[PDB]
């Protein structure tokens, strides 16, 4: 309609060197968006990595079986007494390793 063409006159006819009030106002607004784009960019990095990352299966064919079979031979072995005459080197190892893996604080601390 007219011959003024007001399009690239504000981002070139004056530039930030024409007024620091326009260069500073756009530098404060752009910075606020970057701090939000990152805080928001990583915010999704944890929302997607926790839902589509740790929230997945793997290879647990006999998970409870290892819990039952292992406690089945160890529980039936010990009942009203620490029957060791029937526990072999591995059966006794399960009993000796069961009380030793409960919390190895130190093992060497009596005099000093």
């Amino acid at each position: 309609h007219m011959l003024g063409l007001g399009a690239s006159d504000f981002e070139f006819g004056v530039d930030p060197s024409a007024d620091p009030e326009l260069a500073l106002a756009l530098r404060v607004s752009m910075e606020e968006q970057r701090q939000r784009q990152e805080e928001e960019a990583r915010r999704a990095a944890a929302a997607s990595a926790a839902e589509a990352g740790i929230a997945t299966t793997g290879t647990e064919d006999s998970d409870d079986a290892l819990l039952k079979m292992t406690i089945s031979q160890q529980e039936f072995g010990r009942t009203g007494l620490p029957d060791l005459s029937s526990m072999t080197e591995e059966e006794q190892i399960a009993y000796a390793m069961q009380m030793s893996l409960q919390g190895a604080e130190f093992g060497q601390a009596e005099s000093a």
Binding site: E21, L22, L24, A25, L26, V28, S29, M30, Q33
Partner: protein, 76 residues
């Protein structure tokens, strides 16, 4: 809708406006609160200057939004 406006002096003003309100009505509100002429007031957000003929909602400006106010001098 309440919004905040930060001027070149780091001063932030909290005013009550609506999303259908135009930037011209927002400038008049800042004048009544401080005393600056709306013709010398400039509203800039997201690095883009808002047009007095546009409304806050047109610029995705929601409550608690922080806009930048600048003092326009006499330049033609």
């Amino acid at each position: 809708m309440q919004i905040f406006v930060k001027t070149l002096t780091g001063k932030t003003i909290t005013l009550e406006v609506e999303p259908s309100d135009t930037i011209e009505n927002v400038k008049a509100k800042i004048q009544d609160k401080e005393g600056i002429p709306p013709d010398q007031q400039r509203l800039i957000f997201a690095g883009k200057q808002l047009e007095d003929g546009r409304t806050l909602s047109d610029y995705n400006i929601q409550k608690e939004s922080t806009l930048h106010l600048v003092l326009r001098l006499r330049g033609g």
